Amino acid sequence: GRKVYPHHKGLPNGYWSNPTEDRSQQAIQGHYQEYRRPKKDGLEQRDDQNRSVKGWVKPLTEFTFEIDVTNLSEVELGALLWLLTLPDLHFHRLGGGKPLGFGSVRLDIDPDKT
RNA sequence: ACUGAAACUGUAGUAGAACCAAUCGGGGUCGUCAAUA
């Protein structure tokens, strides 16, 4: 069926912090720096199997967007609004790098603009 | 067993009215490959 990338629950404090540091080889709070290509012989493994990113959108940053909907039934609308009103600690997965933990996002409705 | 002459195929008339270059699509992501000893 439909392939999904489960949210990386329980990533410790500072997991994404200072990401240039090759912490991939130590179990800091029980997790390896799984999103970063490990260094080999002390040099960066910028091979043509991996990409590199000059930056990323920080965690806890916030985006607002709008959905304009037409002729949704109550089931079709209720399915949509369920996704946009999931209980706490349900997170959507967005963009790239999802296998590595990137792109976990919380969606919630702004009711005053709906 | 005396050539008729003279006479604009012209005048009026918008190739135009209606018609969305548009519909769908996360710049994304894991284990394969080779066959013998």
TrEMBL record:
Q: Where is region (Disordered) located?
A: 1-27
- Bias class Basic residues marks the residues at 1-10
The name on file for this protein is CRISPR type III-associated protein domain-containing protein
